[PDB]
Amino acid sequence: MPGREILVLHVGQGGNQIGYNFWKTICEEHNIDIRSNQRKSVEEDKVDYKSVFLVEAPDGFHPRALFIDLEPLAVEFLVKEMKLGSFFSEDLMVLSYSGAHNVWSIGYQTGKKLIPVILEKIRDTMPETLQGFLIIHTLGGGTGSGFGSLLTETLKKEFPGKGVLNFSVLPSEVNDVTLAPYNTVLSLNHLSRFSDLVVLFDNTALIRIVKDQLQFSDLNFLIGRVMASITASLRFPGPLNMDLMEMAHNLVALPETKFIIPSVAPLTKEESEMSTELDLVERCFDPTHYMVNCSGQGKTISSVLMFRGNIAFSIMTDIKSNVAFAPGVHPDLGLKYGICESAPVDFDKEVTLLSNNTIISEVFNRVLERFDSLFNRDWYTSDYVNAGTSKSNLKEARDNFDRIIKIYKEIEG
Numbered sequence: 556m557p558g559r560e561i562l563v564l565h566v567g568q569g570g571n572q573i574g575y576n577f578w579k580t581i582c583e584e585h586n587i588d589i590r591s592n593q594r595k596s597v598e599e600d601k602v603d604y605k606s607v608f609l610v611e612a613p614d615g616f617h618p619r620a621l622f623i624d625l626e627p628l629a630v631e632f633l634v635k636e637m638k639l640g641s642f643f644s645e646d647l648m649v650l651s652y653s654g655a656h657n658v659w660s661i662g663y664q665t666g667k668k669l670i671p672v673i674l675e676k677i678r679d680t681m682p683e684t685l686q687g688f689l690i691i692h693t694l695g696g697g698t699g700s701g702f703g704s705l706l707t708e709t710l711k712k713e714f715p716g717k718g719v720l721n722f723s724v725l726p727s728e729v730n731d732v733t734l735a736p737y738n739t740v741l742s743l744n745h746l747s748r749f750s751d752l753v754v755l756f757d758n759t760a761l762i763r764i765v766k767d768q769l770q771f772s773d774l775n776f777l778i779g780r781v782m783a784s785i786t787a788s789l790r791f792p793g794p795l796n797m798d799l800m801e802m803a804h805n806l807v808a809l810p811e812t813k814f815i816i817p818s819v820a821p822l823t824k825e826e827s828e829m830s831t832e833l834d835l836v837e838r839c840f841d842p843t844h845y846m847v848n849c850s851g852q853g854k855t856i857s858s859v860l861m862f863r864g865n866i867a868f869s870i871m872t873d874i875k876s877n878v879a880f881a882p883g884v885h886p887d888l889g890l891k892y893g894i895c896e897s898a899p900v901d902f903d904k905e906v907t908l909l910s911n912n913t914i915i916s917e918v919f920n921r922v923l924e925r926f927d928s929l930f931n932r933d934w935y936t937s938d939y940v941n942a943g944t945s946k947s948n949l950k951e952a953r954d955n956f957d958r959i960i961k962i963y964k965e966i967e968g
């Protein structure tokens with residue numbers, strides 16, 4: 556069935572390593588074996604939107620994806636360590652071997668020399684009904700931050716009629732590299748201008764959720780499961796079946812409030828049996844299960860909830876009451892939910908929540924403080940200016956980043 560095709564772009568080491576469990580989950584949920592490119596079993600549901608993310612070739616199924624990196628480390632993990640070279644094939648790879656050295660500026664400039672090849676691969680291989688792009692990358696490093704920002708800017712300019720969606724991973728607040736605040740602010744500034752929707756993931760939060768319920772390749776593994784769950788409304792029929800622009804409209808009230816906090820429940824099969832339906836819905840609105848490190852509840856501007864599996868009104872009334880919404884949103888509005896018949900392969904039921912919440916200003920404020928604690932003392936700036944990002948550029952991106960925090964702060968009250 557032609558239509559609603561999406562091209563996924565993995566940029567940087569973290570973004571490509573996430574692609575393993577992201578594409579394995581999507582393959583398994585669509586009755587597809589990622590190791591052989593073929594269907595798992597004869598059991599096939601009569602309606603299935605596999606073509607949204609998967610290309611059907613005569614030999615089998617392949618991901619509609621490009622794997623872009625300035626070093627071959629993450630690609631070697633996919634092909635050599637995981638032995639999935641027939642799925643992550645060489646025709647979908649755009650690689651250099653110079654590296655970004657964890658500097659946003661280096662990934663932006665060096666990635667420009669790969670832009671012509673990427674744009675030609677898109678126009679040569681993508682269908683005309685392609686609805687948009689999904690960019691998966693981290694913000695703390697150099698490639699995923701800089702090259703990812705470059706790709707977000709390039710795809711919006713070259714394809715104005717198509718949506719650009721970002722799944723962006725935030726650095727660890729307490730245990731991450733020195734240059735992470737600079738790269739994060741630079742990336743978030745670029746995404747606010749050229750992205751249609753930015754779904755944020757924070758390594759600080761994912762570590763918290765796993766420990767409190769109870770191996771780096773186990774974090775990106777768990778991020779892929781969540782990223783796949785967020786795209787479920789794009790891949791299955793139901794009351795919440797959306798496309799890229801519908802997903803954006805239902806959350807972006809103002810053009811600047813495009814940063815989304817996702818939450819999912821359950822996260823481990825030990826919690827799956829240990830939890831009922833509303834246990835998962837209450838945990839989705841609980842800031843402990845937010846994919847970004849939040850301290851409080853926060854005001855909800857717009858949110859989209861989804862049930863998956865066998866769930867079978869009573870859920871909404873008691874929950875919508877206890878949820879703090881932004882001033883001026885309607886009491887009958889601000890929250891949309893629905894049931895999806897498809898379920899994750901590991902859990903009998905699952906609840907996902909995408910929330911445009913004002914508490915993201917608190918998350919962005921901590922990023923700004925770490926940025927200022929280094930920038931006000933001219934620390935670690937020497938290699939950004941040698942790569943084409945002046946000290947004045949770091950400030951302008953910072954001030955533009957602060958304007959975003961204030962917009963969310965005004966909507967809160």
Ligand SMILES: Nc1nc2c(ncn2[C@@H]2O[C@H](COP(=O)(O)OP(=O)(O)O)[C@@H](O)[C@H]2O)c(=O)[nH]1
Pocket residue numbers: 566567568569570572573655656657658662693694695696697698699700724725726727731732735758771772774775778
């Ligand atoms: N969750 C997760 N985060 C990662 C992973 N790899 C890197 N990161 C984050 O990304 C930052 C490093 O950027 P990285 O992607 O490794 O370098 P890049 O090639 O320049 O994009 C660090 O601050 C990490 O927090 C991963 O596999 N999973």
Ligand SMILES: [Mg+2]
Pocket residue numbers: 568696
């Ligand atoms: Mg690295």
